[model samples]
Target: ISPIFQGGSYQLNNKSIDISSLLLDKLSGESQTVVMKFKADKPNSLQALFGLSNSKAGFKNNYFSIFMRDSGEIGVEIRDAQKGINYLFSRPASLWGKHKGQAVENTLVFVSDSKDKTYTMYVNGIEVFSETVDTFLPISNINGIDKATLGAVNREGKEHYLAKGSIDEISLFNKAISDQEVSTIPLSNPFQLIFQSGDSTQANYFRIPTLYTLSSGRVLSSIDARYGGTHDSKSKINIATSYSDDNGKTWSEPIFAMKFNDYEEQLVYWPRDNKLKNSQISGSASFIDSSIVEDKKSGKTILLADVMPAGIGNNNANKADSGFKEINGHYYLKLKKNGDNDFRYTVRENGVVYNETTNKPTNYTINDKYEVLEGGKSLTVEQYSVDFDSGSLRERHNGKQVPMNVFYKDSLFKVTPTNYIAMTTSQNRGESWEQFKLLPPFLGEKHNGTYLCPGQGLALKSSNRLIFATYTSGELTYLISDDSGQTWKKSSASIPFKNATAEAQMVELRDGVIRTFFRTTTGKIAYMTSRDSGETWSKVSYIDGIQQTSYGTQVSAIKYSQLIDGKEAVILSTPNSRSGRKGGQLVVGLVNKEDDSIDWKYHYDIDLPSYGYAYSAITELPNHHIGVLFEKYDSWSRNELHLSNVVQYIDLEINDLT
Candidate 1:
């Protein structure tokens, strides 16, 4: 409308466009002023509205940035590599709200008086924020351009800190301009929306990316195809999968690797109930948090995920509820009997439903379509639906006088303290999969009641073992399989931490030690080394200089095939945000051979804004290219989720990291 204020305009809605070429050599002076007339789409997370940064390590280490924090603080940051110091200045000023109790156009001006060693920021021609430093920091020269961008900062030809809103005009002067000069900057017309929500074919929202490079050099990517919205649990989500046979240049059409019966009958070999016909109930039977691995000896591919039942979740489960039992000193999932509640079911051995009262499994069988059947009758009967009305699921079923979701049916209901893990195998490189199999409760052992978050599985080729870490109630514990995943034993030794949740990957160091790099709640990446082949681990320590949000998101770390600095190295992919899950970055570091430690050196940004980033999985392809699978959106916090292609893949040459 009316341009969303008047000359050139750039509309950013979570996407960035490079305008560096427009401002080439426009304001390369030590003393310069930048003025812009703009307004945010809404209150959002921290962002780089526009700035100049050198391409060495990009804006991470050296740059002059003008950005906004979620708290409505507008600021400027200067990185002076020569002085070995960072200069920051900001004040609480809403770029899209009334300033000082009066409605006004959102305008931002940045003035750098290099001679006076003073920096000042203004909103609506009013100096709302200012700071003074000892020395002036000039915009460093890159190999080419000064790295100025519109609505974001550029790093190594990529964009980061993507801002959201409309920019009417931007003016740059070689000298610090007065506050009056800021208001007179000519305005521009109409803005553009680059990345609005996605469409149906793209799905509604995607999350939880899992990446794996098969023994045949094929790359597999899986993610939560969230259809209803971005909400994690109690929403319609399916494990959508795609594969790249050509080093990530292209991917195959998405297939439902693990989906509920409501969407695709082929992926659901389990039984379905009448209530599951309702979108609300069916959405709850979510198969989320996927992990992919390959058996080196057998060449078989394994896909694992947390199979959740309707109306049950990590946040909704009752602690005292029992989904498991002890039989002959071994743990087993408790079966449901005829008078038991719908939530009292469990996945028995051989992917069957164990009947509680019969003390045996259900007589239901699966058909060619993978749909459950009883006496040649399809399990999809008594179809019913529901509405949210703010908060209700169990009650809505009772009030409607119909069955709940499929998870509430007698065939496969599982009452538990929380969700459980399930697995399926694909011997033909993910072309097809076997029936889903639940992990025995004994797999957790003393770690009972703890939920196992999803992550990549590691093949310790040297030890002939399959190792992976799980988030066990704040500590990281291992599930090791010595016999090629036929059975698993929870390791007694675990890396312990507090006020944290973790999703991690295990990489075998060249010296035979295994290093586990984990996401942490301590605002830094935490790692522990295991010299005993994961039987025991050293104490956990925060990785120096790797800062993350208070609640850490998942990270992907892999052993690089090539050497860096003439030594073996490892690459880590994580969202580099201290404020939120966004800012995806990849770092290459050497494995210090002496003490079996890590020393990070070179890094690159995988995604900017860092707010839309969450979990990631990485693998070293046979051709020496690093394959990364990651969530393209912050499905954890964002309300409006869109697109089936929420998970994306990228390939990085080993040289890119160096």
Candidate 2:
């Protein structure tokens, strides 16, 4: 595609193409751009797309290099050590999802704008993002272009992370191309941008994505549709669902599965100041962090979430107040009337509010639809909406205000300011859902803050028992069910640990042995084993290789029916990084039944460590391909300010990583 290659390309697999001579004169300029087209045949780990470098034993200096991380991020590194220059940039987009092995043309453009002193990247003709450099220098002045390579980076003059796929074309321009010219370049984009701020969907933000494949081959995706702001709790949020019939080739429009109160949904941008950002939506009813599980024996599926009432979150919620009161050996949801010192009413059969003192039902009751009714009429209140930038509340007599739920502040009754785990089920592969129900406080009222980790649950291959994970405060626990959720049991909570480990997932390593993987505050994945069907557990242990960003992030792990290297495989998805929530990793571990240990074998990265990567979920598609849904944002620094993130998805064939 360039004057040097003239429509020719490079094939890589432990092989490299020497182009030092061809690039010598082409890069000796103030401003330049390198464009390349690639197809990752076995893009599992860090691999070079195109670059120029010279080897020095195990390490090498580079003039410039562009590469792809496992999951699907394009990264470029420009170095001129002599001039104190070594800058890396991410296109802020990934190309390896959904189209992993389809040989789709991946176009990557890296531009060095010496005039503007900024570096920019584009993927598949879309401008990913850009960064300004403090000290700018041209590639002509960079030292390591003495040797140039395509499809691989030189390691001791050999090749590493060999493309193994095809580098279809490589082009170069001495002058940096304008944005208009970059768009003219063609490349394949397989990622579907489903939810984002200000999109036609009118949703402000989306996060904590979970994916599950029904026995009928239907793929269901669930996420937290955060309006007002993207803060974790105390926001206007709802649970939304979208299903795909053709694997991931097409998806249905998202529909809200669970909604709270009648707050006007408005987009509230995340502010730059950390304190101000956290205060955007201080006390709106919300349902966040979804977990999906299925019962193959009964053909039923369940969706679980952490439900919060107005003005409450984990930190502010009372530990001994689970929003339910125990009376006559039965627990019923308790409520308080406006300006009451304590709860004075209890919701009984048919959601009727019964005064504890008078022992008589009042005129206020909650209907099956979750709306509060007074005197056989629904309770109406003026709708309140938030201003985007100011985060101020305003009356939206934009005239569509509707009846309020009992959970709303202005309603006749309000649930206690606490969090609870709520659940709903589907008998028809997500076409519809049953009414939401509050689960008994598995951890007791002393633990008011608890929720399922955002991922799909497991049904043991050896038994009919279902497996799901949960965490509250700093301890992790499991929710078990038998007879397809007709009856449930809570496993023994985890023993106290040295560090805080919150969200986790469970995978059956063998018939009687179950292993749970979790994200900890320390930046690595920690684990524990349960030999007695989750009734008890072994001491904690840490995974040997995988690392995540500090403050941890939600991760997904599932038992893959297929085998890698003739051993049973368990697939896991998490960001393999310590600096930031970057380098999304999809790893496979080979379980050894004899010793009840896993030989962590193959590791694949989804995105570069420099890009944003956080919470993710993994499921085995009908074709046995792995499907993943994730939040594309920074979890460690919390520095990036954006209105929303494009909840992303990808599908990877097992053979690709084999």
Candidate 3:
């Protein structure tokens, strides 16, 4: 409160700078660089040194920004409204802060070359991060400088992310500068945020992050984009995906790769929420909890999503019909036309629409895009238009206006009101994805529901067989594929004893041995190993290796190819909380070859105990860095607070774990 003046800087205690009339040529050019020297009053809370944003509410997103997060991470934000370009650039918290017990004042320099959309950052005159974007640039696509502010961050014509610090020297150069002008000590990993809450285009809430890096250095991530509210299923949710071509520095905006076609989206801020708080929720059909893995040999990617019925989830699902029926020794997607009580319709091979009950083919067909087809044409349907509010959707194919939802109860065609699985594949490095199909009766339709374990799947090195952990009727299951995901075989473990919860993770400890660490109500992390590639497993053992709640939160664990600490390692991202989701940490385990177990060695805490650290996913990034995506709020304890939030990502190196 009393930093009134500094040697050459000015204290910004709610100070404001109106930058509406700044020279556009200098601040709004394609190639630009910015440098700022600042020290925080405290190494917590959000504060901006120099920031720019669109004053209009519709474009309140930051066009340019440099700030510090409460978690001690320092970074910048830049987006272009005219071209719809959004990219995130930031460094990990460990890379910054007090060096060798000195005061936390460090120089931050940012450089951008619009030609390739490459952005670089340096601190204390050392290059820390650099990435050339593929889709969007940092400064060039910004069109022109809109409204900006210095010291404090103004968005939508209001400044909420306040400045509680001092700025020494802040300068802007119209051209991208060389390292001779700026730098850092040693920074290799950069963080690119894929989704941000409150963006007009994205859902209000996101959860269940899955991060993976392909061999070509392309990074892909997907999560449950929770609209309406974050109530798991029973609420509208879709799987949104984004990828970065240049390591972790830049990412494209999100797009719906899987969707619940019938659920009308309504954005609401549900606070401390649970089913009781928002009791009027009508369950929505959803493709929730996507787990993706790529085949190294075939270079094909497979994405598995749990298919939910309209308004149905794991808890209330019927343990009978798998929403599919086996007819003539073949599997077909079962459906029911309006007014038919017994499910009589089934979609046959090659997108042919059939009715087995009547033993006759229908006039319509379901195509690859999940569309109803008639006479080789899409049977015109209706959905809530993008501009509609409150009263949205179809109720129109005809000039007269007749609304139709394929999943609606009274629609011409409807999916089964039961749970199933939907799989989509990408053959060419995710450039194009096609062949969306519901899986066959892998579980023999013995149980109505079975879904992939939320985070990721592992590919065995020896057999090259792709495997993903699954949950079905309170037991752990694995789906094995030999022909690169076109076909699969499932092997489940009864676990001998003890029922497990959903949302577990896996690590291929060694080539032959695969271990699954799962969530349990025993107030600890429970795990088992399968030497025969998930066909059989060792007994369940609750490893107190890392702290977690008895009602465990979802965790992410994956194998790193390179050796760390002179041993093969597996990294786990989990919250060190026995009471609630808080204090997230990354625990690296050294594989004990003799027993195929892990030595829970190095640990790195990303957030404090009081912080709302919840579900997380981890993957090995390019250059052996650890890439992570996790929630900022407790998805279980604070449902009401779960809304209006998006998951965040960070990249860390092996040394950072120690």
lDDT of each: 0.62, 0.72, 0.68
TM-score for candidate 1, residues paired by index: 0.63
Quote model 3's TM-score.
0.69
Per-residue lDDT for 591 in model 1? Answer: 72
Global CA lDDT computed for model 2: 0.72
> RMSD of each candidate?
15.7, 8.0, 11.6
Per-candidate clashes come to 16, 6, 18
Candidate 2 lDDT over residue span 1-658, tens digit each = 2443323467776577777777665555688887877776456578777767656553465556787776455777777656767877763334643243345677778788888987888766545557777788666566645667777777566776576667777777777788887878766665565555555346667878888888788999888888755567777888888888987777777767777755766655445454565554665678888888888788888888888777666667666777776777677788888878889998888888889978999988877766788888877866666654345343343456577776675666788788787888888888778878778766665457466787778777777888778876546768888788776677756645543547888888877688888877766788899887787888778887988766788889888888778888888888887777767778888888688788878877664455567788788888888887887656444454343454677667887665
TM-score of each: 0.63, 0.74, 0.69
**Cα lDDT of model 1 by residue, 508-551, tens digit:** 89545888888776788888878878888888777775678777
Candidate 1: stretches off by over 4 Å: 1-202, 262-283, 318-322, 329-332, 341-378, 382-417, 443-450, 607-612, 633-646
Query: Could you tell me how far off, in angstroms, the CA of residue 474 lies in candidate 3 after the best superposition?
Result: 3.5
Question: What does candidate 3's lDDT look like per residue over 426-461, in tens digits?
Answer: 776556566457777777755565767888888787
lDDT of model 3 at residue 616?
86
Worst 10 residues of 1 by lDDT: 188-197
